């Protein structure tokens with residue numbers, strides 16, 4: 001991934017489900033705001049513990 | 050929203066185990082579906098005018114899964130869940146060598162310890178391969194785009 | 196931060212717990228956080244000093 | 245298929261543990277009325293209404309799993 | 322009690338809905354060999370059979 005740099009804080013989220021590993025962030029749309037928008041979906045085969 | 054697919058070498062023999070009410074070794078130690086999602090199951094055969102697909106060594110499955118704890122003797126049965134994997138696959142090879150093959154592997158004490166143990170059986174082929182596909186649908190996981 | 200994900204726990208070459216087996220995920224920010232590269236591969240520990 | 249090039253000789257550099265320096269309490273709770281890092285609905289966006297939803301969330305005003313990075317030994321350059 | 326018959330003539334005692342206690346038995350047993358299977362030696366006199 002290409003992520004730019006700034007000075008505002010960052011919120012990141014990681015989870016998994018049987019369809020894939022879902023990675024959420026704010027920067028991608030809410031650079032000035034903050035939210036969980038799914039910027040990545042890993043096509044995973046097995047769950048992670 | 051999406052489709053999820055699994056393909057495998059499923060012969061005509063344990064097709065009777067394909068029932069959702071069936072709870073054989075296929076449906077207990079090898080493969081269990083999600084009843085909450087509508088699905089379809091298809092058994093197919095290689096056409097003789099088709100060399101694009103290949104064949105494995107032979108069919109196989111696990112007829113018994115069990116886990117040893119750190120005391121070597123408290124046995125925890127392992128069952129396949131809805132689109133989940135018991136660790137029996139991690140110790141059973143892609144092709145089981147023979148019927149009744151016993152595989153054992155060490156487990157760390159902080160994970161319960163002991164030895165994961167599995168017993169596997171094999172099924173021979175006919176002149177042509179019979180395989181199986183499972184198709185399962187997804188309504189609102191992501192963009193509705195298939 | 197750089198993360199690693201798997202499903203197995205084991206002791207190291209010196210007995211410290213934390214060995215992961217089989218295919219596992221590692222993600223890493225690099226280049227002052229510009230790149231966020233992730234990869235689900237087989238790790239091999241080195242055996243030197 | 246992948247490349248992901250490769251590495252250097254089988255000789256690793258040293259690592260030390262000194263974690264007493266890393267042991268310090270910086271109190272930072274998490275407010276839910278300020279919505280500090282909570283999952284959004286994946287495809288169901290609304291407007292100007294309050295809505296209940298069952299998902300994965302943490303508690304309120306929690307402590308965390310506090311870690312921190314630092315710089316190594318140096319002298320001069 | 323009595324002169325015990327031999328290994329091919331093992332004598333059976335069955336027990337159901339009563340109080341077995343290996344604490345009064347193994348303390349009075351000069352245990353010189355102890356092999357077992359499928360019920361842990363801490364659980365030979367802990368669980369309810």
Ligand SMILES: *[C@@H]1O[C@H](CO)[C@@H](O[C@@H]2O[C@H](CO)[C@@H](O[C@@H]3O[C@H](CO[C@H]4O[C@H](CO)[C@@H](O)[C@H](O)[C@@H]4O)[C@@H](O)[C@H](O[C@H]4O[C@H](CO)[C@@H](O)[C@H](O)[C@@H]4O)[C@@H]3O)[C@H](O)[C@H]2NC(C)=O)[C@H](O)[C@H]1NC(C)=O
Pocket residue numbers: 007008009032033034
């Ligand atoms: C470290 O210090 C820097 C200061 O440089 C902080 O950066 C500031 O952060 C605040 C908080 O978000 C910003 O304030 C916001 O300004 C918006 C206007 O921005 C305009 O100008 C910028 C710069 O030119 C443009 O890039 C941008 O597109 C806009 O044109 C307001 O609109 C914001 O209000 C809206 O958002 C908030 C939050 O969602 C809502 O609550 C409001 O109701 C409203 O909808 C907001 O006021 C400020 O602009 C930032 N400055 C700069 C230069 O970037 C860092 O945040 C700080 N970091 C830390 C960790 O403290």
Ligand SMILES: *[C@@H]1O[C@H](CO)[C@@H](O[C@@H]2O[C@H](CO)[C@@H](O[C@@H]3O[C@H](CO)[C@@H](O)[C@H](O)[C@@H]3O)[C@H](O)[C@H]2NC(C)=O)[C@H](O)[C@H]1NC(C)=O
Pocket residue numbers: 246247248249250
């Ligand atoms: C830093 O990251 C970059 C980007 O991933 C690496 O550079 C380039 O990486 C790609 C993929 O690993 C390499 O391309 C591949 O080459 C093969 C031919 O062997 C081709 O068949 C593939 O389709 C793919 O294009 C590319 O060679 C590589 N460029 C280089 C090495 O100059 C870079 O290697 C990374 N730096 C590291 C690992 O130190």
Ligand SMILES: *[C@@H]1O[C@H](CO)[C@@H](O[C@@H]2O[C@H](CO)[C@@H](O)[C@H](O)[C@H]2NC(C)=O)[C@H](O)[C@H]1NC(C)=O
Pocket residue numbers: 292
């Ligand atoms: C969003 O919701 C607010 C909250 O109800 C709305 O504000 C109300 O607007 C009505 C209409 O003028 C007033 O009678 C209320 O007193 C307002 N309440 C508050 C708390 O402000 C607002 O109009 C809504 N906006 C949209 C676009 O739906």
Ligand SMILES: *[C@@H]1O[C@H](CO)[C@@H](O)[C@H](O)[C@H]1NC(C)=O
Pocket residue numbers: 138139140154216217218
């Ligand atoms: C996982 O790694 C272990 C190493 O102990 C190995 O025995 C096992 O076969 C591996 N399984 C898979 C599926 O790679």
